[PDB]
Design a protein around this ligand. Sequence first.
Ligand SMILES: *[C]C1=C([C])[C]=C2C(=[C]1)N([C][C]([O])[C]([O])[C]([O])[C]OP([O])(=O)OP([O])(=O)O[C][C]1O[C](N3[C]=NC4=C3N=[C]N=C4[N])[C]([O])[C]1[O])C1=NC(=O)[N]C(=O)C1=N2[C]/[C]=[C]/N1[C][C][C](/[C]=[C]/C2=[C][C]=C(C(F)(F)F)[C]=[C]2)[C][C]1
Ligand SMILES: *[C]C1=C([C])[C]=C2C(=[C]1)N([C][C]([O])[C]([O])[C]([O])[C]OP([O])(=O)OP([O])(=O)O[C][C]1O[C](N3[C]=NC4=C3N=[C]N=C4[N])[C]([O])[C]1[O])C1=NC(=O)[N]C(=O)C1=N2[C]/[C]=[C]/N1[C][C][C](/[C]=[C]/C2=[C][C]=C(C(F)(F)F)[C]=[C]2)[C][C]1
Lengths: 499, 494
Amino acid sequence: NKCDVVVVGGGISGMAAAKLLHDSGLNVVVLEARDRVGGRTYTLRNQKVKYVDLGGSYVGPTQNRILRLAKELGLETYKVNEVERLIHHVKGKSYPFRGPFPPVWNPITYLDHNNFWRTMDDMGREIPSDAPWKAPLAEEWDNMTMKELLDKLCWTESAKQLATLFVNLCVTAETHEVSALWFLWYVKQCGGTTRIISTTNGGQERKFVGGSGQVSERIMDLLGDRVKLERPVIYIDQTRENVLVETLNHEMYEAKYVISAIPPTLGMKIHFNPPLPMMRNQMITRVPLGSVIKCIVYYKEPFWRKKDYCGTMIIDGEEAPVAYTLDDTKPEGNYAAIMGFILAHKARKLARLTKEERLKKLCELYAKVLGSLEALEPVHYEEKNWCEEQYSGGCYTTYFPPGILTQYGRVLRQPVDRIYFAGTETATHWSGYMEGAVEAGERAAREILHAMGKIPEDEIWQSEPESVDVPAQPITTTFLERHLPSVPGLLRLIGLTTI
Amino acid sequence: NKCDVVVVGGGISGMAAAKLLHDSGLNVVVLEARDRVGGRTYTLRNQKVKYVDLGGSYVGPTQNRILRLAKELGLETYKVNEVERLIHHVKGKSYPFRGPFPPVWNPITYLDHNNFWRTMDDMGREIPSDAPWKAPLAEEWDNMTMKELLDKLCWTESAKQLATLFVNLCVTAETHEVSALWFLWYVKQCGGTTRIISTTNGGQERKFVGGSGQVSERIMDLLGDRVKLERPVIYIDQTRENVLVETLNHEMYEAKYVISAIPPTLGMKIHFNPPLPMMRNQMITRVPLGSVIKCIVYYKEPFWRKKDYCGTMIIDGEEAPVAYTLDDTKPEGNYAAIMGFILAHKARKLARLTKEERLKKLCELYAKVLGSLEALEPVHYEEKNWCEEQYSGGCYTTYFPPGILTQYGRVLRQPVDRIYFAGTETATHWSGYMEGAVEAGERAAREILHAMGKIPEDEIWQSEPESVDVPAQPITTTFLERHLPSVPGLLRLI
Ligand SMILES: *[C]C1=C([C])[C]=C2C(=[C]1)N([C][C]([O])[C]([O])[C]([O])[C]OP([O])(=O)OP([O])(=O)O[C][C]1O[C](N3[C]=NC4=C3N=[C]N=C4[N])[C]([O])[C]1[O])C1=NC(=O)[N]C(=O)C1=N2[C]/[C]=[C]/N1[C][C][C](/[C]=[C]/C2=[C][C]=C(C(F)(F)F)[C]=[C]2)[C][C]1
Ligand SMILES: *[C]C1=C([C])[C]=C2C(=[C]1)N([C][C]([O])[C]([O])[C]([O])[C]OP([O])(=O)OP([O])(=O)O[C][C]1O[C](N3[C]=NC4=C3N=[C]N=C4[N])[C]([O])[C]1[O])C1=NC(=O)[N]C(=O)C1=N2[C]/[C]=[C]/N1[C][C][C](/[C]=[C]/C2=[C][C]=C(C(F)(F)F)[C]=[C]2)[C][C]1
């Protein structure tokens, strides 16, 4: 079975790579482990839900590559409901609000909160998107956990608790599990704190009509029989003139080049000849994925809207199974639903329960948070625990524990002879997202076009025109946000005055 | 290819498991990925060295299982040279000493050092060897790195730098990479700080005559054609009556049970049907091995002994490629040599050099520390970088980053249907060592004997009589060591 390029993995990244190469007139094969394409995207269809995303779902302004690819495939977006009030639930009580950040009134707490978000972005600006290990304090920042950074930075428990939730929710891991440098990089390369946490004008603004799984499905339709399902790759041999790729089901593929479009650690499932170089050999043992269960509770009507709640709940407490929800009602206003994430250690703990037991705990939580008995009357439930997936390893993405990004980060997308590396983890803008998957797949594909002498080197990395359908409002700060003192800043001001 | 038990991996753990099952009358097969047995042990033979251990080498008192297995296979030990003085090289000067711990003279630094070692053992006494996640403060300790703990505990740079060397040397990882709970467990389950760092009466007392690779080689000799070399396992299927195990070279093996005797993370190289349970699926992505280059420089004579130095060097600071050495001279006094470890980030950095460039750096360091121009005239050099091994992942062993041991530790030896788990990482005494490899292999084998109805549950875990050849002496402390205050302790008194 001979071709120009074998693509290992049929997620968005591998499918985007294969489509680009196909369009450029090369012969490509996609080898996919599962009986389906889409990977960490999966759209379930049945009569009770019509369609529902159980994996990656949201897209927003500045994610121009996924929007362009989706639009070319004939897909459309709609806006996630944020008409009514958001809810912050903390210490057993709900506080409705507007705007992206839960507000605080206590003046000291206000300064601490303001300084926390500001400092995340300040540190971010020191970190190159394409080379985080080149930050001036890369080593110092990489040698501490996010827990350690929050302990230093947050002078109030209020700010520390919200910051903790921010980390758990954005990277499906505990603050003590992840590198501070890596987390700060991750946020900055999404455009900063406001962009990453926002619905309106941020990452959660929109979803695809009919589900995100259609992106991979529609590319498979374009590629025809070039996509091979239930072909897990077990062996890559680069000792001869052409690369040999072998699958579990006893097939051999021969190619000039290979794109690895799988999560970095899942490279461990492949035996390499010759052995990988030392730094990659070790890197792929050091980069786990996070832990999450995505849960959707269906209701007769979006009853929360009648109480002037949009369906967004930011829920702080150890007893709460879910820390974040969004309205998942269809744009037509039917199949009323609340989507919630069970995160990090809670995914581990609550996976021990039955599906029926998890549904009951979510409804009881939502009833309390929304002050609504109607939340106790679900009509349907769907969920997906991504921790159990052999060919994902977790969700949403790969996290770096302390010390790893500075020692091993440079080899993430370094070619190994005729193997090139795609997958969202290798992106420099919205790495961890569907957007980053498209950036990495197309970049890897063009690395091979360059190696073949079909394009000049300056065309490997390509800028993306802004979407005309999803324009990006700039991120702005106020004078007060920029110049109000931190808590230690204020204490320094007090000590000075009184002298 | 039908048998009773397939053992995946022909390291010491897999070989110990296979031998026990074979001796009890079961039909075993060992599937080994490499063209050799031994795994993280490897003995090279050539005329220049006679033999040299390039992997695991040292054994000592309280490691009774590896000593008993080796004795049964016809091996003998000899004592690592510790007759003359040890050296601590501090801020560019050598300070000779005797006894296991580098001493200190400044009274404040003395209290801080004393408190650091004492506190490691105090904390270890609250950590169960067989269940570190059941420590009273398991979450608190697991959620900190060793770097954070040392930052709290060490009031002097002196103590912090020696404690950092201790971590780097013992677990081939940086203090910021590893869980405090995991590291404290690791030390405790080797018998404490004195036992783990000591040559005389500790882990480094002895080596095997002819090399540690003989343990795995001589078990392979017993088992004959039951050991299959260059058979990397790619696929395990437990859907049917018997377990099916497939190798990369297209062979299929059928058995009633399987022993996985490979480092935990290397489970990722196997495709499982049905999929592994969630907790193991994620665990095996969270447990890396450390980074080390083991380096042996040969000389015409053990010239250091003439200056009343034994060859042990403890070398502080960033600039030194090697933080620790031992005399590697043969018991007969010939093939004179110094063994050194290049640790953690330095293994990563110095791997970019040539073999000749590393030799030069080592020789110049040793000349400075030993105070002898003779160190600049090596006659031979051997090294091994364990970071490059596909079927090890690193050395010496698996380390646990912050948060992982409490969340996933319970799954390490939990059977998955008819797969049982061996490997040194699953031991409860000298886990990470050749001793733990034997303990785990034999325990996993006896779990299968019990599942088969051949032994009672109370015989799965078996005690080991003390070696007559390598008896252990008690670890002792002084009244002052036990009762002198810490630095903050002394400050509260003031
Ligand atoms: C899973 C998931 C989930 C659940 C979710 C999500 C996700 C996920 N995400 C991500 C995505 O999905 C990703 O990135 C992608 O998809 C990726 O792609 P790629 O790279 O392509 O990869 P994959 O898919 O994996 O593919 C691969 C493939 O391959 C294969 N294999 C393997 N192995 C093998 C193979 N083959 C062959 N052979 C071999 N050996 C497989 O099978 C596959 O197929 C996402 N994304 C996006 O975009 N979106 C979304 O949505 C998502 N998701 C999520 C998210 C979430 N979040 C967001 C953010 C938010 C926040 C908010 C806030 C915060 C804070 C606050 C305060 F309060 F504090 F302020 C507020 C708010 C949250 C949520
Ligand atoms: C590598 C190494 C080195 C370099 C070294 C060492 C070691 C290592 N070690 C460890 C040992 O070796 C181990 O543990 C063992 O060996 C293990 O075993 P096992 O478990 O059995 O495992 P392995 O071997 O890995 O095997 C496995 C097998 O499998 C196979 N595979 C895979 N995959 C697969 C397979 N097959 C089939 N299929 C598939 N898929 C493979 O291939 C294999 O074969 C050790 N150990 C002992 O015991 N000893 C020794 O010596 C050792 N080594 C080291 C050591 C070091 N050290 C010690 C300690 C000391 C310290 C001292 C001090 C401190 C401190 C101080 C102050 F100053 F601070 F005070 C002083 C002093 C040093 C170091």
